[PDB]
Amino acid sequence: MKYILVTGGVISGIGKGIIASSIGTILKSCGLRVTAIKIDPYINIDAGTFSPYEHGEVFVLNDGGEVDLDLGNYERFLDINLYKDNNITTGKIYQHVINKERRGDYLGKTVQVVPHITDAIQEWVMNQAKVSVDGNKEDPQICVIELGGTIGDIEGMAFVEAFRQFQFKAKKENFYNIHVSLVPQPSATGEQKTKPTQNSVRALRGLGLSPDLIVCRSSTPIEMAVKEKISMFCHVNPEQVICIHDVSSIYRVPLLLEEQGVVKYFQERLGLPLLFKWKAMADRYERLQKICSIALVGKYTKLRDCYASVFKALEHSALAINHKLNLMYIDSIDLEPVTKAEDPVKFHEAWQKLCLADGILVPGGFGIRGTLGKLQAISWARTKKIPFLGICLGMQLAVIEFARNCLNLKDANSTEFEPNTPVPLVIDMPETMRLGLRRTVFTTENSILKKLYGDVPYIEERHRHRYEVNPNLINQFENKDLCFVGEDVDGKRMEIVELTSHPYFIGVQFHPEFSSRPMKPSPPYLGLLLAATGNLNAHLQQ
Amino acid sequence: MKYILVTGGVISGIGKGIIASSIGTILKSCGLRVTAIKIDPYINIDAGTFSPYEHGEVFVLNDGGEVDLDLGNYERFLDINLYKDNNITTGKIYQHVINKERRGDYLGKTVQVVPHITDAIQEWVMNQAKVSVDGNKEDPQICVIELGGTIGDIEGMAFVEAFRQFQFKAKKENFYNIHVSLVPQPSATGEQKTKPTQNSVRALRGLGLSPDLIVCRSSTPIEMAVKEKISMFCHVNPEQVICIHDVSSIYRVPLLLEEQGVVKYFQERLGLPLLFKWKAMADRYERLQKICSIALVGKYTKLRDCYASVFKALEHSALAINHKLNLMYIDSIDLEPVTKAEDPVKFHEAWQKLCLADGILVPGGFGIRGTLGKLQAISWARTKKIPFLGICLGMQLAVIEFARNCLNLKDANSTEFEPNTPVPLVIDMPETMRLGLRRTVFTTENSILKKLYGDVPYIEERHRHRYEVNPNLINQFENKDLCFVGEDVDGKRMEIVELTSHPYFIGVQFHPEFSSRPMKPSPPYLGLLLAATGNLNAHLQQ
Amino acid sequence: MKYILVTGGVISGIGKGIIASSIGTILKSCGLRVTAIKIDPYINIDAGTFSPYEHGEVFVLNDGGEVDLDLGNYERFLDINLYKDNNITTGKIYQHVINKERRGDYLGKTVQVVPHITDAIQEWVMNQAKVSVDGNKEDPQICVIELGGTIGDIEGMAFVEAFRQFQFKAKKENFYNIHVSLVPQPSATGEQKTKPTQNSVRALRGLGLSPDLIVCRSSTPIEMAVKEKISMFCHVNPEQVICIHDVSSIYRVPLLLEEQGVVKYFQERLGLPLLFKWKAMADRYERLQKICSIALVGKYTKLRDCYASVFKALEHSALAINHKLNLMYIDSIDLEPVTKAEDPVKFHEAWQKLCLADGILVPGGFGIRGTLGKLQAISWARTKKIPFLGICLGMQLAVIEFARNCLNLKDANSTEFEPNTPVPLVIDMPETMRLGLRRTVFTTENSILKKLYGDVPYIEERHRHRYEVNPNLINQFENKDLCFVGEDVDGKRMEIVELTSHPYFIGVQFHPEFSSRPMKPSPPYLGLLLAATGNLNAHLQQ
Ligand SMILES: CCOc1cncc(-c2ccc(C(=O)NC3(c4csc(NS(=O)(=O)C5CC5)n4)CC3)nc2)n1
Ligand SMILES: CCOc1cncc(-c2ccc(C(=O)NC3(c4csc(NS(=O)(=O)C5CC5)n4)CC3)nc2)n1
Ligand SMILES: CCOc1cncc(-c2ccc(C(=O)NC3(c4csc(NS(=O)(=O)C5CC5)n4)CC3)nc2)n1
Ligand SMILES: O=c1ccn([C@@H]2O[C@H](COP(=O)(O)OP(=O)(O)OP(=O)(O)O)[C@@H](O)[C@H]2O)c(=O)[nH]1
Ligand SMILES: O=c1ccn([C@@H]2O[C@H](COP(=O)(O)OP(=O)(O)OP(=O)(O)O)[C@@H](O)[C@H]2O)c(=O)[nH]1
Ligand SMILES: O=c1ccn([C@@H]2O[C@H](COP(=O)(O)OP(=O)(O)OP(=O)(O)O)[C@@H](O)[C@H]2O)c(=O)[nH]1
């Protein structure tokens, strides 16, 4: 087996997960079966513990693993599906070792970081790297291990020590360390500052890992004198220092790695006998003259990364219909009349963006904060016939709203926002949380999503929800415009709903965005982009 | 006595010397006598060893100390004149300790970093901090010590260890540590990254210095959540975290420190019973509608810091005449006909900037590289009557050119560029280098500079030159337009020259820029700005 | 070329220089030309700056290099003669780099530890390792580099960083790191503590050097469980962990390294196609039934290392005559009547040891402290006919005393102790210090030392003295018992003196001990041991 460790210097946020994902897509293009492991050095067992504002979107796996958005980047760049244990954390490792200790598996010896935690990491990495994430029932050739955090993070040091040891088991033909670092430039008239990279590589070398590649992230291109200054002081050959400057689309980041000779490096070092899909997407993306203006009416909108998979699913869809996405990230609280009193300019800016909406997206979330502003946008979409996609909470809200405004059940709500709702239309219905892959069966042949999904009898999509439509109160909707077109395989759960009288007003109980890929846009997001540009009728006739 | 140590985190280039200088100007405005010490952890004994491209302009002191540009920042923000030993270096400290060892001053004991190097640093700091740089024959109250480099620089660690000890001699009412750090933001839609500051303060605390203040440098203002994230993880109170964002003029950086409560901090902690000069310069600077376009025809143009004092002297002058400076930094190599062949677009851009020149500045330098381009600009200035200031080399070239073009001595040059010049007009004339403060006597009452300097019989200016006008060959100029208006007190050295037939064409052998202050622009730079805007005649009548 | 770096862990004093010297003698026995370099990370330029109490005896080289006693260990274990620059120090390296900087040799670039100091170290090591110390005019095969101090010493870190780099120039077939560490055991009923060795190797690995061998120094043998505990936690194979316990003679330390497979390691790794001299000395040493009791009347007796070469020269001599040395180190201050008042028990113990003296040794030193006690012992030796060897100061005192007691010149002394001595018999006579190898010519054919030295016309011996016999005042001795048998080649300096009436009472102005080797005892020390056992007359007839 082969291992590429991707370590972070100075700051984590410089697209190290895009480097790791692009490294994987280069190896994929070279014909290798590639798997990926994320290490998050936090003590948290899973990302299901987090607010979206902490690390971005909580990405959901088929097995119901709630993981970091970098696992989503692996699944978007590589045609893989990951499992829970492809996310390593310090919490998972320490609990495993504690559980072993409490069983006496360590034979009455003093359990300590080296060896036992560092053994557990190597054990985990070896065993999980053999797992078929590629869908093909064959062990992969190469594992791209992203070591999250920075090489200054004290929690990460056990993993760096584990990899120092691992580098001597999996030899230098097997184990590669790529170090991703920031080269800041405070002003364009001063030197590009290599000192953070020098200091960061000195730290990494102090932990006993040698950079095979140093990836210098910068805004502008790195000057050749600055490249040589990195080479000398990091003690690495000029071929091993690569410049990843900012580029016009994500699709060029694999190409820039290719241009910088990373493909050559790995082809030489691994002995591998190109990225035309990436070049095709890239060159097409710059030439898109048309725009589709989508309103994302989100509550987590304060950091755009909170809806990363959602945005990427829209951009897959936008690219597939040859339009640029104008994603009007609206903070949903701004649409509420509370903000008309408190900040009237933000209110009228938000409502102006909602007027400019060719389509409206209401993504999922938990709680009532900003959730009346979601209802304001769904009401606007419903009445003014604007193309609508409601995800999870956005389905629940649409069902509640149709009950209020079209069935006159003004007392309808969720047993989330008001536990003692008079007609509890949305209710808590655990399985625990309905979490990971579930089969939704189509129960209406004339549904829009069925046809977008290829006229299939069922779909299997990723869920992350506790609340459901109350199955008695479906009787209110029975012969009215809002039709529950999709149900669970157990029947007693309504998983897709459509307005029969509207060109595109979809509620889905699942999260389609997690299943979206660059050349396979998730059909509910595709339908939104299609409807917003009038192409839906043409597409469905085609 | 009081001591403020200013330490650098992440990267040095974030204006830490402007923080140190602004800290001093705050204390100056509070009525304190302030001195300054620069520590440069390099093994170089002086900045006279450097190319300008290495650290910026080699600033020259009255005693002939060739020092870092930060000593120039101290002299510009504080009305002080510094001495050689206000620049500490590792070279100076280690040589001192070696010299002591070789005399047996360490009594046959094993000389080592702690104590002996760290004692030498504390010895030096205590003794030099008592020196009257303020011109007043009274020991200053406070010493601002800028620790150059970064807190990751291994050479700096002896000084941090020395200051750890010093903090226990000079107690916490005396000794303050300000830590200047970078908070980068890779994109405006991602978090402002405090992790470099966290890691940097953890390193500083590991070296046994506690931040009294953490100065967060950033482009944009720091968000309050980011400020609290710094406060928690750096283990410092919110009042001690200050945001220094980018601002519209240098004159606002003291004011922003004042606004962030740094003046309050030091007034409270030092027990001091405001920055109106700074506010006056700042608010006036933004309101300047007029522009003066100056061509800086400088061989070291590749980094603007190579002419920092020169640019600052022009900006002092520009502000004093209520004009904005359009400083057209021209690489003189681009004006040479070599570049007409090799890069014709750069040539015609450079010559277009030279056409747009309201005044022409030829700053000093060493070597023949770019000298023909300086001569091209001096020729242009001489013939087309464009206001000219030649500094040192620019005087030597003007004298050589007038000999070539006006006296027909086409064989004239320096014994620098051609040692065996047929008529050696500019010759090596050591005292070594004519270095630091020397008295130039005016020997022509009708000279422009005499009147700009206040109609004085002599001036004392800072020199840095080995070459002189050959005193025999002055006979060629004797009765012609180019008059040697200023000479040394020894007579045998020509130190200022003027074209009598030109509105402003000045050669000075000294560097006037080192003596320039914000409310006292150096008169040769003032005369250039005045001549370039026609105001010179009005000023000299006034 | 090949390089063995010998690095110190926990504490320096565990015989790391004996490991380095024994490593060299193993390679010597394998037929290699071996040179040695000592690095002392102190800022001191030479050991001539030190008191003997600081680091032990200041060993003197042929060129007049005053160096550490470890250079003496190299010269005793290897048949080499070293030069000044085989002692590297931080002082020497930093001064060299400063001198280069001041000449502009670093081309105006910022001089700093990495690269420039670490380059200077590698430069020095490469160039000095090519030097023929072996007397044969051929470059040696292997350089044993002892890195002095500990791997915790901050001054040493530049050398460890230099060797990290050097390990990548001189590859792993060329460059070996041996780490010498202490494994303490607080009581025999508790575990042998490997944690200092674990922590020390973790530090060394953090500096980027991997132990090829870990030498565990201990009192008792290392237990196999403790050896495995070192192996696991230091991350090294059991063959690379060696136990060097305490052994009955120095001659067994090469043999114990051989037994532990260090000879096998280097024979395998270097590809070399045994230590019988060492075994012969060792096995003979344990079987010596006879004892020779020598009084060493030395002012520096407080640390025995202050007379290391002297003690080793006596032990070479003792072994050569098949006697054990009872070296009665007497602090000469105890023989003085001052101590009869202040500490009468020490006085009578010292005088009892002087009564038990089969021979008396008065080693060299500087200053009047303990000189009266040396004179007391010389008086005792002179009158009671006890075999005497006076080295340098011991010659000067013997000449002064014979003048006082036998010529009645009671006013005689040195212009060291009393500058204004009435008859200045011992005077300052610089060449500075008469330092290193000088030719002493024999000028009396019937002298004892001439015959001990093989009946040679002259000898060349190592000197370290400023004072001489005043050549006029030789007229007092002219026809009396004290004959100046040896003079310098310049004649005007008396370098050996003998009492013609005494069986062995020798003053030598040089230090014979520095020239002494295990199978070539220095003849003045041999003559002392021979005279003290009556064998001198037999030897001189033989
Ligand atoms: C080392 C990184 O350095 C640099 C340097 N320069 C630029 C970027 C860069 C980073 C992120 C983005 C981005 O997020 N763009 C979007 C998108 C569409 S599809 C997708 N990702 S994806 O589906 O996982 C799979 C197909 C790729 N992202 C539109 C939203 N665009 C540019 N990154
Ligand atoms: C912690 C620093 O943070 C920030 C934040 N925002 C902005 C700046 C900033 C830094 C440098 C400059 C600058 O160099 N400006 C010029 C000038 C004129 S006078 C002088 N300096 S001076 O004479 O020493 C004495 C009077 C002050 N400089 C025009 C050339 N302008 C802005 N610095
Ligand atoms: C890694 C070291 O571990 C251990 C373990 N166990 C024991 C010792 C040990 C260390 C020093 C001594 C010592 O100094 N002994 C003496 C002597 C005679 S000759 C000479 N040295 S020598 O001439 O340089 C060359 C011929 C060798 N020394 C009598 C004075 N004896 C034993 N060292
Ligand atoms: O204020 C000062 C004083 C001294 N120095 C010293 O100058 C040398 C270079 O320090 P720099 O920070 O310029 O580092 P560099 O050129 O190696 O890396 P980048 O600029 O690309 O980030 C180091 O030895 C440092 O301590 C400064 O950087 N700044
Ligand atoms: O890729 C990953 C995985 C895990 N983590 C982990 O998340 C935690 C926060 O890591 P951050 O880099 O977000 O740090 P911070 O929020 O304290 O500081 P700034 O963003 O302002 O720079 C740390 O425990 C780290 O190891 C990541 O940062 N990124
Ligand atoms: O007082 C205590 C508590 C705990 N421990 C813990 O026990 C473990 C072993 O700590 P030891 O000091 O016994 O180390 P070791 O056995 O690896 O090495 P030596 O004894 O040969 O020197 C470590 O994890 C330490 O923190 C103690 O050593 N002592």
Ligand SMILES: NC(=O)CC[C@H](N)C(=O)O
């Ligand atoms: N994923 C979501 O949008 C969650 C919706 C809702 N709070 C539930 O748990 O059903």
Ligand SMILES: NC(=O)CC[C@H](N)C(=O)O
């Ligand atoms: N300061 C300068 O411009 C130097 C000018 C010239 N090279 C000299 O040495 O005189």
Ligand SMILES: NC(=O)CC[C@H](N)C(=O)O
């Ligand atoms: N080496 C010695 O014993 C020194 C003796 C005496 N102090 C001198 O300087 O000559």
Ligand SMILES: [Mg+2]
């Ligand atoms: Mg730099």
Ligand SMILES: [Mg+2]
């Ligand atoms: Mg963060």
Ligand SMILES: [Mg+2]
């Ligand atoms: Mg133990």
